[PDB]
Subunit: 267 residues, 4 copies
């Protein structure tokens, strides 16, 4: 019953989180750990960073790892993942792709791959965030009248874009729940004489500082009451957890392109 899993970018912060997750999962075993060709770390035990001698040495031999693994979990770089994709296809590996920054042709390449292998690709592998979108969708219909909708988001001192993509996705989900679009009703920050708030407005506030990983709150502010739905990310560790649920979903599947909506039965 036990998933034979390889992890890509095994020396990276994400790869290390994925390794600790695989080791801890009772229904998975770590059988491969890849790092780039020429990495100083090649030859080290995958678990050396933690307490453990896993007996799995970091290697750059993509072919052997794909031969020996049934699953590869990959949160690295688009061109790196595409190299892994070709091996995954020839070796019939089930693939969980948490990498980001693909072009449209590359994304379509991943879908095409889904005709031959089973894979999950998602921009957000978090159980929490994906469920929160569905919660927001129900809340936006139930609170469609009498509630002013505000989206408040906090991230670290280096985030260059306001509001975050997650906040924007949340806004779109909320707008669509009543057949609207965001750019009709979105207000981004407020300064000066902003006047009476229009009841249809979706107001965004973007807080920035420290090393905050990402907090997102949707506030439904009514007359005499408030309802808040908040997601707090403490670290990329939550992506490792969703990646394993993705692997468990893929265990039942022969071929197909899937996202986290499929994995979580949300769609």
């Amino acid at each position: 019953s036990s998933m034979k899993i390889a992890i890509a970018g095994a020396s990276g912060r994400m790869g290390r989180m994925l390794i600790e997750a695989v080791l801890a999962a009772p229904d998975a075993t770590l059988v491969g750990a890849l790092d780039r060709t020429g990495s100083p770390q090649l030859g080290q035990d995958a678990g050396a960073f933690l307490g453990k001698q896993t007996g799995v040495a970091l290697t750059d031999d993509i072919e052997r790892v794909c031969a020996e693994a049934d699953y590869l979990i990959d949160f690295t770089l688009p061109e790196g993942t595409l190299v892994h994709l070709d091996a995954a296809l020839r070796h019939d590996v089930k693939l969980v792709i948490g990498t980001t920054g693909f072009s449209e042709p590359q994304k379509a390449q991943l879908r095409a791959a889904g005709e031959k292998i089973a894979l999950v690709f998602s921009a957000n592998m978090s159980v929490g965030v994906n469920v929160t979108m569905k919660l927001l969708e129900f809340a936006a219909k139930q609170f469609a009248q009498g509630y002013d909708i505000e989206i408040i988001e906090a991230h670290h001192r280096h985030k260059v874009d306001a509001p975050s993509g997650t906040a924007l996705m949340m806004g779109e989900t909320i707008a669509a729940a009543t057949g609207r679009s965001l750019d009709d009703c979105a207000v981004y920050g407020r300064h000066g004489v902003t006047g009476e708030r229009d009841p249809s407005t979706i107001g965004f506030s973007a807080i920035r500082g420290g090393d905050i990983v990402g907090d997102h709150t949707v506030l439904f502010a009514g007359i005499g009451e408030r309802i808040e739905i908040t997601h707090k990310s403490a670290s990329r560790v939550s992506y490792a957890q969703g990646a394993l649920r993705a692997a468990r979903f893929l265990a039942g599947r022969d071929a197909g392109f899937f996202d986290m909506q499929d994995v979580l039965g949300l769609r």
Copy 2:
């Protein structure tokens, strides 16, 4: 076409909020303002406290009010409310009852044979909707999330945790066919050890004049999801009462609660 609404206990704190909500609702008109025989406000314009003139004078005349109104919204006392019910029964009034609570509940379910009424102890849109949000969230986070319910109330609240927090617990427990009696931990203290993943832990904060905050925390590996309801005051029940009246506009007779009102059951 606008709902012709009367308000009971009209010079009281809750009555005033109801009057405010009826005037502000663009589909409701105030036609009656009922108060006790012993009220010092009889004869005054229902809106005077707002500096408005409504054409509606506070009266103790239960009969005239019920004859003249299509709806009566009543958040008063059981005795006065049951007197109001008999008059509603005779005049075919759609009744919205925010009173709490009495044995007595039987008589007003029995009234639903002849008139349309809504009764609920919690007439807030927010709390009722939140209950259904928890049901979905409990199923979706059934694995990997430690569930904690945190509730805050005023310095005079005698019971912990709140009945609302308990309802949240039961809803959550039930969403996976469970009972709260199997998994509840209330106000932990001392050496409690490794938290069991199935536990629902309750925390009860007491102080000041906090009207009532309720948070359900789903605490997972690397992340947390929180669903919070904050009550600022009884004004939210006045908003819910108006939705109750709107629902009742379509109904001939029957006993209903906020679930029916909001289309949730």
Copy 3:
């Protein structure tokens, strides 16, 4: 020995809260309840709305009230308040003024030559104390902490950020000899780039009937420290007014604010 206190605008929302606070304070006694000539409540017991009998009947008689009271607490309108001030000047009343605001401030600083009075737009213990907490925190977190001020108010609030949030910013800026005009960023949106460590960023949330929440976040590497003030209603100003009266008990004449009252400057 208990403070002999009169309340202005006694049948209004704020007047009622003041009456409540005076009765509840174990060192204060209600001796006067003043209202407008045009009030429909004259003659009624000041406590009737509470189901209490105080021995104090609502009157428009400014002269008698000031003659009979040692203190007058007044949160009404400038015109009525300035009429109240002249009577306080003639009867040596200790005046607590929550009214806002008028040009007019000059006359009531000038009144401090002859009587003892407190004037403040923000009569809350919590907000004034929080201001001094921020001063200490800004100095201690002067290096390594990004400072963000987050404020929430109701759907009708026209200005952003709130004046309170601005005062918090200025206090923080000043704690390191700085100006807010040098470092403030209000409502960021779009590509804003690397946050400058000196920036004080303001966020303004608007919706519902939120009375006013203000949070100062100190966001550091691995940790955050938050200092938050939440106003539920004007009842907190009634509490502050009573502390103002207590402070005034010791004073012969003089113009004072909440800083003096709470011993903060």
Copy 4:
């Protein structure tokens, strides 16, 4: 002007955070990295976990590291730290000790050491927490009447003790600010008919779940208003930051036993 710093337990999670902090600090250089004798990791570059070849190899030679370093930062184990202490004394090293679980004789050993070397020892190296205690002290005097004081604390699913030591320290600080003691006024959790709240009570609530590192809130609940002072720890990274401020304080000191109150000028 640049502090020559060695880090103990260089393969541990804390040691790794301390290494990244030293590397990033503009006024410090990493000159030594210690790990236990027999560690598999001996010989590796201290920065291999990050992107960087620091040229500092992990070693178990305590003598050489203390000879070459001016500062040693040590968040390891009490018996390990005591071995380091003796080297620190013979080599005149400035010591920052973040280790915990010492006995009273051992603590007194650290103080005695302070006659010969300059050192910082503290149970909490966080700037945030230490400043928060002082904030709480001022707030407790200002809010001494009319405010119900509640302490709410959240930690991970494995914390066995409720409330946390930090919460208890917060309670004691608050009680002392009006000449009281905690065990006279503390109420720990609430269940059942608890009755009218006594205005002097300090009520504690302990929330448990997930991997929450530690949130602490003091609530001053008044009539018509609330004042909250909250400290959120995201990770042990904040201890690394306070350890460096400790090193900077120690740069000016020849000998002496110091804690974070000294380091931050709070006392």
